[PDB]
Design a protein around this ligand. Sequence first.
Ligand code: NA
Length: 432
Amino acid sequence: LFKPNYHFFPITGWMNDPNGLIFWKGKYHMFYQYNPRKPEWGNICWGHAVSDDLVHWRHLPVALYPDDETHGVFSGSAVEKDGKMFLVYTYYRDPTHNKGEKETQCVVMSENGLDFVKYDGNPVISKPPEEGTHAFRDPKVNRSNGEWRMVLGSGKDEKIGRVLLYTSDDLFHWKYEGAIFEDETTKEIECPDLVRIGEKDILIYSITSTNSVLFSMGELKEGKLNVEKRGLLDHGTDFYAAQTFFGTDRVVVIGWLQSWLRTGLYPTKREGWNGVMSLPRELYVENNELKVKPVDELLALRKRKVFETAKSGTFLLDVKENSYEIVCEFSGEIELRMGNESEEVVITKSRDELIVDTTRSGVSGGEVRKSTVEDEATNRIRAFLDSCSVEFFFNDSIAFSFRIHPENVYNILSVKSNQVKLEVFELENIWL
Ligand code: NA
């Protein structure tokens, strides 16, 4: 029952962070932290999928394996150089009784996107830059000012999380340019990604203790990010380790649609698998504000319109599965409920605040999350419901993502507002 209709998830075993996101030779490649052995983390490989359109994924062979039973191929990114695909990633060695973990940054190449070959001079970065650095991982490499730039996650002195910057002319030899950013709120920053949108430098990164993806927007000057604006990339309970695609026009992000904090609460394990990826979102800047919306390609999933109303009420939906999109335009306040006789998720706009309640959603319960929002003359909520998730998008600007595990189809919809226009689209199963 819980296998997603239109989100990416592994054929078996455990999946976490998206890796190596790249548009290369006309297709979107997605890799991921993978354990095929069982639906729990360990013995980490890079799984591999591809799509033409960011939506219709096809599984490919596992791309990268650890050399033995005490290593893992941890997170990283992908780049294109001389027409070839390069993956840059953290290679991890287990601690023993006497030694802590060891992390190095390595390179692999592919001419065809199927056969992946190790670079002979690995590791490309053998050690951290300063004493007392840990969580030294997740190289996100991009092109800037005629050079390669890599941002890396780290923590210093078990005290403060920081993003490290290296540069390179060739991808193999890297120069340390210092720590560009730190966050006192955590011991470690994971999965950084440094992007440029319309004259602004935007650093996206993840923090473990809160399972959140944050951004800091401003300008990179003199080896330091000057922050003008900070915020969350997603306001729900299950969005983590976001990464951006190399090689696209738009800034397109995918995150892991799960939380480490809530992982032991989830039931997909009983079906032999764990982990889901988020729908892709476009990041853009308007009126000096970072905004987040669903990627346009998701429109291709719409297979039929099953319901529409221009009035408040409670409605029986002619749907047989939890695989659908709500598009709702409204003025002022709203309460929107989706569910059945025993379960529901509720979203409410009340005055100044958007609030989402998944506590009664299904067999994993849920939580309440809230954000202050700006009113528009017409407000818009777009909701994607799949077998074990709901993702909400408000005014093409803010996103809330949640894992839920309903025991039954959410075939009851109720809306209350003035000037309501609401429609429901059945969404395609991408697998069969
Ligand atoms: Na190589």
